[PDB]
Amino acid sequence: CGRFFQKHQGTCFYFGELPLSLAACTKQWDVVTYLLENPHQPASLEATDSLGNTVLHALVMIADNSPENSALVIHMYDSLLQMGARLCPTVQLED
Amino acid sequence: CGRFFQKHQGTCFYFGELPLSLAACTKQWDVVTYLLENPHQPASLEATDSLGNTVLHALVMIADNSPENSALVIHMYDSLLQMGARLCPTVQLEDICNHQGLTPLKLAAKEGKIEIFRHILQREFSGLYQPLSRKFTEWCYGPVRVSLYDLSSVDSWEKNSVLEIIAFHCKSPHRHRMVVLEPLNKLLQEKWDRLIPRFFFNFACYLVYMIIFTIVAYHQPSTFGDSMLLLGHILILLGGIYLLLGQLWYFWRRRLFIWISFMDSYFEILFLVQALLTVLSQVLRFVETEWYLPLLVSSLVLGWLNLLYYTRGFQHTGIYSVMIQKVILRDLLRFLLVYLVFLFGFAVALVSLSREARPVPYGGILDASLELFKFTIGMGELAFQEQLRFRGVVLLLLLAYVLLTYVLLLNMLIALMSETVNSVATDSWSIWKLQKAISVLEMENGYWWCRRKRHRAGRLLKVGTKGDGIPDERWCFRVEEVNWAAWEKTL
Amino acid sequence: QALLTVLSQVLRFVETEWYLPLLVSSLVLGWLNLLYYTRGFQHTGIYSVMIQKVILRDLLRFLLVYLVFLFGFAVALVSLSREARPVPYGGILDASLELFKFTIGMGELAFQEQLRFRGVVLLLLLAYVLLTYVLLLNMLIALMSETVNSVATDSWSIWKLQKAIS
Ligand SMILES: NCCOB(c1ccccc1)c1ccccc1
Ligand SMILES: NCCOB(c1ccccc1)c1ccccc1
C-alpha cells in the first residue's frame, strides 16, 4: 500500500496490492495455480486489500472497453470463479 | 551534374548524382554492398553532391506518400543506416547539414514527407544497433509502457527546430497533419497547458484596450471629464502604436512567411490594418479633418471583429472559427460573383424602364440596387406600379429576379454550405491543432521588446550505451501509455 | 417555477409593482416545462432529446460570435449618425434593436440622406448584413443539419435512459 499502486492521477498501476491479484491481472494462469494449491500455505481467495477490493474487484477495475482487454478480463474472471468454486464452495465470492 | 538529374520542372529524375545513391534509390541492395565493400576503392558513405545532399538526403527527397514507395524508402533507409553504423561508427550520418543547413529529419519535415518523417520520428532497434534508436522503453512493468522519445533537433529551444520548420517553412497542402503525431502532439499539448496564463493575460489586456477604445469613441467630442477623455485618447494612441510596432516586428522577423500561406493565419494582417487605421485616425484628427470619424469607427469595428482571434483558443470554439473560415473561402465568393452579375443586370434593366410615365422609384442605379438587395434581405417591395406605362414588364422582371435569386441562389448556398460543413470535419480539428501550435510557438518567443527566456523542456535521461567508452546522454520526452496488444506479445 | 410562483404571491401580498413580471415569468416557465411530460412518447421524446442536443452542441457559439459582431456594429453605428449635415441610432439599445430587426427579417436598410456620412453608414450596414445574414444564420442551419445527422442512435439510447430514470 504505497503510491504507485494506488489508483490515482499520474503514473500508477492498480492490481489489488496482492500477489495473487498481480498474477491474475498479469495473465499468469500458472503462478496463480501454484499459490492457490501450494501445500505450505495456500493463499485465501477472499482476502481483501486496503480499499476493500478483492481479487474479482481488482479484475473488474482494470477492465476497459478494448476488445483484447475485455476478452482477457472475461477469461480470467470465469476461470478464477470456477477455480474458487472448486476450492471452497461454501463461500460465494460474487457477494 | 547536368539538367535531367537536377530537381526541376519537366522530364527529371533526382537520385543525388552518385552511383551509391543511384543504386540505393533503385532498390539494388547488391551493387551497394559491392561498392561499400570493394577492397580496391571503397566508396565513402558521407560524400555529398553539388546541392549538399547526402545519400540519406537523396533517399528522403524521392520519398512520397504512396504506401509502396514509403515502405521501400523506409527499408532502404534503415538498412543503409545500419550498414553505415557497422562500417564507420565514429561518424553520425543522421547529423549532416546540406547547403540549406538541414538534416534528413528536418529535410523530410520541410519537404512535406509524412510517412518517412513519422518513421524517423519513432523508431527502435534490438540490442545491437540500439544507439540508432529514437523511441526507447525504460520498463514494461505490467501493461504500462514508459516511452522516451529523443528530443534532439526537434525541440523548440534550438535556433532551428522541426516545429518551427513545419509551422513557418513547410508549404505542403496538408502540413496540418504533421502536428498531430506522437510527441509533436503531446509536447505541444504540454506547452499549451504551461502557456495558458500568457495567452489569457494577452486576451484580457486586449479586451481592456478595446473597452477603453469603445468608451472613448462613445463619449467623444461632437475639467474632470475632459481630462478623462484626454487620458483615454493618449492611452488609445499608445496602444495603437504598440500594436503597430508588434505587428511590424512580427512581419520583419517572419518576413519569409507570407508567400507560403497568406490565408493560414490572415489575422496579423488584420491587426496591422487596425493599428494603422487607429494611428492614422488620430493623426488626421490632429489635422482637424472630417474623415476622422470614418477611420476611427472602422478601427473600432475591426478590433471587435479581431477579438475572434483570441476567442478561438478553446476546443469548442476554435473548430467553429476554422469552419467559418473554410466556408468563407470555399463557397461564398462564387455566390457573390453570380449574385452581383444578376443584380447589376436586373438593376440597370429596371432603371432603363420606369423612366417613361403614362418620388420616382428606381431613379438611379443606387436606388435600384438597394431595392434588389431589399428583395434579398426579406423586405422586397413587390407591388403593381400603376403609374409607369410598362406595368407588366416591370412586374415580370421583378418576378423573374426573385425567382432566380430568392429561390435558387440563397437556398442553394444553404445546401452548398451544408455539403462543405459535412466535408471538413476532421481536417477542422487538425487545422485547429496547427493554429494552436503556431500560437504556442509565437508565445514561446518573447514580445518585440522583452526577450523571453527559453524553457528547454524534456528530461536529460541517460539512454543505453553508445559503441564507445564513457557513456552518452540524450534529452527525452517521457510518455506513459497503457497498452495490452503490445503487452500480450511480450510473453 | 415553484419559487417564482410562491414569491410572486408573497410580493403581491406586499402590494408591489413587481407582481406581474414574476407571475408571468412563472406562467411562461410552466408552459415550457410541460415538454417534460410530453417527451414520454417514442415519437416525441427523441425530438426533445434532439432539441436539447442541438441547443447544447451548436447554439451558444453562434450566440457568442453574433453578440460580438452585433455589439461592435451597434456601437460603430451609434458613433456615426451623430453629426447631421427622431434620430435613428440614438443610443445603444436602438441600434442593437435595429440590427436584430435586420436579423429577424425586417431590416430597415435605407439611404439616410440627413446625416453627412451617407456612404459610410450604408456600407457598414451592408457589411453587417453580409457577415451576419448570409454567413452566420445559414451556416448555423448547416451546422444543425450536421449535428442532427450525427446524433441518431444516441438519441434513442438517451431517450431510453431518460424514460428509465422517470
Ligand atoms: N475581418 C474580421 C475577422 O475576419 B473575418 C472576415 C471579415 C472581413 C473580411 C474577411 C473575413 C471573419 C472570418 C472568420 C472569423 C470571424 C470573422
Ligand atoms: N426552459 C424551458 C424548457 O427548457 B428549454 C430551454 C429554454 C430556456 C432555457 C434553456 C433551455 C427547452 C429545451 C428543450 C425542450 C424544450 C425547451
Rounded distance between C-alpha atoms, residue A75 and residue A73, angstroms? 6
The Cα–Cα gap between B371 and B362 comes to: 8
Q: Are B463 and B137 in contact (CB under 8 A)?
A: no
DSSP string, B335-401: HHHHHHHHHHHHHHHHHHSS-SB---TT-SHHHHHHHHHHHHHT--------SBTTHHHHHHHHHHH
C-alpha cell at B400: 423573374
For ligand 1, what atom is nearest to the CA of residue B312? 15
Q: Quick check: B213 and B204 in contact, CB under 8 A?
A: no
Instruction: Search chain B and give the residue with CA nearest A5.
Output: B142
B116: cell is 518517412
Q: Which residue has the cell 426579406?
A: B378
- Ligand 1 centre to CA of B300 (Å) is 14
Number of H helices, E strands in chain A: 4, 0
Distance CA B402, CA B375 (A): 7
Nearest one of B179, B230, B196 to B431, comparing CA atoms: B179
**Three-state DSSP class for residue B423:** helix
Long-range contacts made by residues B152-157, C-beta under 8 angstroms, separation at least 24?
B152/B474, B152/B475, B153/B95, B153/B103, B153/B105, B153/B106, B154/B105, B154/B121, B154/B184, B155/B187, B155/B456, B155/B457, B155/B458, B155/B475, B156/B191, B156/B441, B156/B444, B156/B454, B157/B454, B157/B455, B157/B456, B157/B457
Q: In what order do the strands lie in the sheet with B144-150?
A: B144-150, B475-482, B459-460
Bridge partners of residue B357, in order along the sequence: B388
Residues paired with residue B481 on neighbouring β-strands, in sequence order: B145
Smallest Cα–Cα separation from B428: which of B324, B272, B336, B322? Answer: B322
Containing B314, the helix (H) or strand (E) segment is: none
Surface-to-core class of residue B268, CB atoms within 10 Å of its CB (0-12 exposed, 13-18 middle, 19+ buried): middle
**Dist. CA B238–CA B244, nearest whole Å:** 10
Q: Report the candidate in B254, B294, B247 with the shortest Cα–Cα distance to residue B275.
A: B247
Measure the CA–CA gap between B155 and B455, rounded to whole angstroms: 10
Please answer whether residues B348 and B368 qualify as being in contact, where contact means their C-beta atoms are separated by less than 8 angstroms: yes
Which mutation among C27, C28, C32, C56 tests ligand 2's pocket best, with the greatest number of atoms within 8 A of CB?
A: C32
C83 near C116, Cβ under 8 Å? Answer: yes
Distance CA B266, CA B461 (A): 41
Give which of B167, B256, B112 is closest to B437, Cα–Cα: B167
Residue tagged 449574385 (cell numbers): B339
Per the CB < 8 A criterion, the answer to whether B326 and B315 are in contact is no
SS3 A66: coil
B458, burial (CB in 10 Å: exposed 0-12, middle 13-18, buried 19+): buried
Residue (of A34, A92, A26) closest to A59 by Cα position: A26
Interface of C with B (CB under 8 A): 58, 61, 64-65, 68-69, 71-73, 75-76, 78-80, 82-83, 102, 105-111, 116-117, 120, 124, 126, 129, 133-135, 138-139, 141-143, 145-146, 149
Across B29-50, b (16+ Cβ under 10 Å) vs e yields eeebeebbeeeeeebebeebbe
Torsion C54-C55-C56-C62 (CA) sign:
positive
From chain B, pick out residues whose CB is under 8 angstroms from the CB of A74. none
Instruction: Print burial letters for B2-16: b (CB count within 10 Å at least 16), e (below 16).
Output: eeebeeeeeeeebbb
Q: What type of residue is C16?
A: T
| Of B73, B53, B54, the residue nearest B63 (C-alpha) | B73
Q: Which ligand is nearest to the CA of B322?
A: 1
Q: How far apart are CA B129 and CA B138, in angstroms?
A: 17
Task: State the best of B332, B410, B418, B420 to mutate against chain C, taking most chain C CBs within 10 Å.
Answer: B418
Q: Rounded distance, CA B331 to CA B153, Å?
A: 41
Q: Whose CA is nearest to atom 15 of ligand 2?
A: C48
Q: Which residues pair with C84 in a beta bridge?
A: C115
Nearest CA among A34, A37, A13, A8 for reference residue A25? A13
Q: Provide the 10 A C-beta neighbour count for residue C104.
A: 10
> Which among B37, B76, B34, B42 is positioned nearest to B59, based on CA atoms?
B76
Nine-digit cell string for B355: 423612366
Grid cell of C81 as nine digits: 449618425
* Terminal Cα-to-Cα distance of chain A (whole angstroms): 24
Verify whether the Cβ–Cβ distance C120 to B373 is below 8 Å: no
Q: Which residues of B touch C93 (CB under 8 A)?
A: none
Q: How far apart are CA B269 and CA B248, in angstroms?
A: 10
Contacts of A15 in chain B (CB under 8 A): 142
Distance (Å, whole) CA B71 – CA B65: 10
Residue B193's CB is within 10 A of a number of other CB atoms, namely 9
Nearest CA among B154, B167, B158, B161 for reference residue B439: B167
**From CA B250, how far away is CA B256, in angstroms rounded?**
11
Residue B296 to residues A36, B276, B290, B334, C81, Cα–Cα distance (Å): 84, 11, 11, 32, 14
What SS3 state is found at B150?
A: strand
Q: Strand, coil or helix: what is B147?
A: strand
CA B380 to chain centre: 42
* C48 C-beta neighbours (distance < 10 Å), count: 19
Beta bridge partners of residue C85, listed in sequence order: none
Closest ligand by atom to C136 CA: 1
Q: What is the CA radius of gyration of chain C?
A: 22
Question: Cβ contacts of residue B242 below 8 Å, gap of 6+?
Answer: none
C109 close to ligand 2 (CB < 6 Angstrom): no
CA A22 to chain centre: 7
CA–CA distances in Å: residue B191 to residues B27, B41, B443, B444 = 41, 51, 10, 9
At A19, is the secondary structure helix, strand, or coil? helix
* Residue reference for cell 553504423: B85
The H or E element that residue B81 is part of is helix B67-87
Beta bridge mates, B475: B460
Q: Is B181 left (phi over 0), alpha (psi -120 to 50) or beta?
A: beta
Nearest-5° Cα angle at C42, C40 to C47: 85
Which one, of B402, B374, B416, lies nearest residue C105 by Cα? B374
Other beta carbons within 10 Å of C155: 19
**Resolution in A for the shown PDB structure?**
3.3
Instruction: Please tell me whether residue B69 adopts helix, strand or coil conformation.
Output: helix
Q: Cβ contacts of residue B401 below 8 Å, gap of 6+?
A: B342, B346, B372, B375
Please name the residue ranges forming H helices in C14-151.
Answer: 19-33, 35-38, 42-57, 60-79, 92-104, 118-129, 137-150
